[PDB]
């Protein structure tokens, strides 16, 4: 190595 | 901010101790981790992607406008990765991995990214370090607070084989994903042992940590954790210092293998230089 999420509202981006 | 660095609002400031910090102090002379306490790592940052809304790496807050991370999180040609300021955003003050924490977390845009000029992605990730300047300063709170950068003497006394440090992150739990921030305390390992565990050429700008096969205990960082902080609590002034940055490893929690970390102090002059000019 080497390198489910709720969307972010438009309160930043 | 940096004069009140390393003192957590919910712990040191109130004279309260977290569940496992005694383990670190007793040694002074994320796979297999556990859920972090609220406000346990107020400098933990989430490097987030704007296009497919995704967690990329961990990072850390060193001041109101500067975030520290691993350079491989931003540039890694072997995998066709080369992110610019506008492809990313940082989420500070988080505990939940997937949830947008309304009224708690803060999101910032990047103004400028600085990758170490001698970062060696071609071979062994030598000088795996990068700084990110936030477009606007972040306000501190009970969940947002910077960690301290070590000085010569702190590095000297704390960076010793057997001394335990702490790694935190929202990465993979095995080589699925955690619901909240994970934490694991790991002992620093002797350089000869680090060298003898891999074919990769390790440099002075790295150190490895983890338990040896015979020690019984386990634990390691994993995908999703890189770029994150390896911190230690100074027994002299009670502040938390970032000694390393989760760099690379061969797999996660493999027997006989160790996680490698960027040696923050050895690259401190580069850090100061960047912040003193930009």
Description:
- The complex is a heterodimer of chains A (13) and B (278).
- Helix content of chain A is 0%, strand content 0%.
- The termini of chain A are far apart.
- Chain A is elongated, with a radius of gyration of 12 Å.
- Chain A has 13 residues and is mostly loops.
- The two termini of chain B are 16 Å apart.
- In chain B, a hairpin with a 4-residue loop joins strand 2 and strand 3.
- Chain B is globular and about 45 Å long.
- The longest helix of chain B is centred in the C-terminal third of the chain and has 8 residues.
- Helices cover 10% and strands 28% of the residues of chain B.
- Chain B is built from 4 helices and 15 strands.
- By secondary structure, chain B is mainly beta.
- Chain B folds into 2 domains: 131 residues, Trypsin-like serine proteases (Thrombin, subunit H), CATH 2.40.10; 116 residues, Trypsin-like serine proteases (Thrombin, subunit H), CATH 2.40.10.10.
- In chain B, the strands form 3 sheets. A 7-stranded antiparallel β-sheet of chain B has the order 1-11-10-13-14-15-12.
- The chains are: A little secondary structure (13), B mainly beta (278).
- The interface between A and B is medium-sized, with 12 and 32 residues.
Distance between the termini of chain A: 29 Å
Distance between the termini of chain B: 16 Å
- The side-by-side strand order for the widest beta sheet of chain B comes to 1-11-10-13-14-15-12
Taken in chain order, the helices and strands of chain B follow as HEEEEEEEEEHEEHEEEEH
- Tally of helical runs of chain B: 4
**Which chain pair has the greatest contact?**
A-B, 12 and 32 residues
Secondary-structure content class of chain A:
little secondary structure
Number of domains of chain B: 2
Number of strands of chain A: 0
What sort of overall outline of chain A do the alpha carbons produce when their principal axes are compared?
elongated
Percent range of helical residues of chain B? under 10%
Share of β-strand residues of chain A:
under 5%
- By DSSP (H or I, 4+ residues per run), the number of helices of chain A equals 0
Bin the helical content of chain A.
Answer: under 10%
| Rg of Cα set of chain B | 17 Å
CATH architecture heading of the largest domain in chain B: Beta Barrel
Structural class, from helix and strand content of chain B?
mainly beta
PDB class: hydrolase/hydrolase inhibitor
Keywords: thrombin inhibitors, serine protease, HYDROLASE-HYDROLASE INHIBITOR complex
Assembly: dimeric
Entry title: Design of P1' and P3' residues of trivalent thrombin inhibitors and their crystal structures
